Write a protein that binds this DNA or RNA. Structure first.
Length: 225
DNA sequence: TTGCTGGAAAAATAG
DNA sequence: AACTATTTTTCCAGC
């Protein structure tokens, strides 16, 4: 079942859930550089993923890849690949289509719970990707990703679950300069002479049914909401 | 050695 | 063909 297919995070009594979410900022590294580390959690630990409602005593693979955080439907990000780090967990890398995918064991003895400390992020160069035949996606200014996890549970048929993380900003500059919105309804985020502006219409909100968006502004705007 | 950075200069590029 | 403010890629330095 291709990565480009959408899947539920649950089916029947099975549910794949992100227990601890990644930080909102992880600076990716290039091939012309050293590793810039595993994706960290705000704890100072690491993302945690759990599968619920698996009763059997045989372990499963958890697959990890880097997807989009865009308005369109979710897909492998053309310009970022997961990076194996070699760390508590054993892991290995396979290719699936044009996409690199990392696989971690998910074990009954740990309640199908895993700490993700062995996945960093590699930034590919826009020029290189945009040349590949069949590719029309645009790198420039597309530096937000999500960790995507999927799992394959066999019966007698295969139930295939996917959960994607909150967006991560992988750009050094955007992390220094931009406000980032994590949660709403009280706004929490990062790098908050701040203003908040609603549009459709344009109207500053005062502060430290219809379809309509807001943005937090510094300069240097967050994404629309 | 490699891993893992922070910080920033060089290079690229959109319009 | 050339420019410039903005964005990406390489580079330096320090454990």
């Amino acid at each position: 079942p291709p990565l480009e297919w959408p899947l539920s995070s649950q089916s029947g009594s099975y549910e794949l859930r992100i227990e601890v979410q990644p930080k909102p900022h992880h600076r990716a590294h290039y091939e012309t550089e050293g590793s810039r580390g595993a994706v960290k959690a705000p704890t100072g630990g690491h993302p945690v993923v759990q599968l619920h409602g698996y009763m059997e005593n045989k372990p499963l693979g958890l697959q990890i890849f880097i997807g989009t955080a865009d308005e369109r439907i979710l897909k492998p990000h053309a310009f970022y690949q997961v990076h194996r780090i070699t760390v508590t967990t054993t892991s290995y890398e396979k290719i699936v289509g044009n996409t690199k995918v990392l696989e971690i064991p998910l074990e009954p003895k740990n309640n199908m719970r895993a700490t993700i400390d062995c996945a960093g992020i590699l930034k590919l160069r826009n020029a290189d990707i945009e040349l590949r035949k069949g590719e029309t996606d645009i790198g420039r200014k597309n530096t937000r990703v999500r960790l995507v996890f999927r799992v394959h549970i066999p019966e007698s048929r295969i139930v295939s679950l996917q959960t994607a993380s909150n967006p991560i900003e992988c750009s050094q500059r955007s992390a220094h300069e931009l406000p980032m919105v994590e949660r709403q309804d009280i706004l929490t985020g990062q790098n908050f002479e701040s203003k908040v502006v609603f549009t459709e219409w344009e109207m500053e909100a005062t502060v430290s049914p219809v379809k309509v968006n807001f943005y937090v502004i510094n300069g240097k705007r967050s994404q629309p909401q």
